[model samples]
Target chain A: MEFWGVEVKNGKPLHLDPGLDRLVHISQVALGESKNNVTEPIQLYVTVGSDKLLIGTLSHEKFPQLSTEIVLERNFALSHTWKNGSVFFSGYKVDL
Target chain B: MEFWGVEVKNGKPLHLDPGLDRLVHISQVALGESKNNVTEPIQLYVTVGSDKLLIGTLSHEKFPQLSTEIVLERNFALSHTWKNGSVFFSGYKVDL
Candidate 1:
């Protein structure tokens, strides 16, 4: 029940600071479109495994057809530390 | 917003009476498991055709791996009538 994310803005991974440390996997992938050409997708909760995942999108061509906002429910063994990257995200000390 | 569904039980399509008349399509597909070999899949709401759908399951072999309960959100024009079938369900006048 860990949540960390990166945002792609202007065809770049804006702030992907502090990447994951230990091995983790996604349970569910939730996509929300801030500007909706189409409606957003919603889910009640995500599972731990069950072959669910989230694929990152940065391309401007066909990827624009998909929602811009996305989140992954990552189940981590241990979050020791994360490294700074070309993206931005807040490392909230909480599990949801 | 029309909500009518068929249940597959005991390896047969039971009580699929009063089938849809006018053309309609699904918005979202919701799957719930009454008895869980696995957890249920939930949806906040459904849309009217973003290529979303529900495929029924009844077989006992490989089909048992999937959740048994399912529903389709069909955006239909109207329902003037329906007929009885082998299966069982109450025909309530509602939209959800």
Candidate 2:
């Protein structure tokens, strides 16, 4: 697809394209104080496609607060160039 | 690091920050015709961190030409909220 948008909310199954076989889910969120008194929000569990992993927390001072839900949209146009024996990614703009 | 940049050139070792353990390499470039005379540039081989795979080509019409070297940069500040049983992605911006 050229573009897509999804809504992510706690305890809800992330909506994804039917053509997409991959699935992403969130399990837990922890907000703790950081070195600069900035709250570093962390998700203790995340399942991306097939891998269930932990995403590092980020400083909330520079970013916005994540309250109930977040909207994600992306424009994709897969492009790559071949040189020598490999290809390099050229396109697939993701906005979140 | 708060920000980073990298250069990807055919046959050249991609220089990454010392803290990085992953590696990406390109091996070949193939240009073929698409449905609309737009060259779908495909890279046959790509090694991302540890996975070696093929990247799909894109319509060259909407995207720019891929030269021998491509530079990539990124800005990052992670943030997420907690509720129910999950943690959502907050921020990590990449540019090419």
DockQ of each: 0.03, 0.03
Q: What is residue B94's positional error in candidate 2, in angstroms?
A: 19
lDDT of 1 at B5: 33
lDDT of 1 by residue, B1-96 (tens): 222232322223221222454322222122222332332222122223454233443221122222123233345221111121111121112232
Candidate 2: TM-score? 0.22
Q: In model 2, what lDDT does residue B2 have?
A: 16
Q: After superposition, how far is residue A83 of candidate 1 from its true place, in Å?
A: 34
Query: Model 1: residues >4 Å from true position, as ranges?
Result: A1-96, B6-11, B15-21, B34-96
Candidate 2 falls in which docking quality class?
incorrect
Positional deviation of residue B11's Cα in model 1 after best superposition, in angstroms = 4.5
Candidate 2 chain A, which ten residues in sequence have the lowest lDDT sum? A80-89
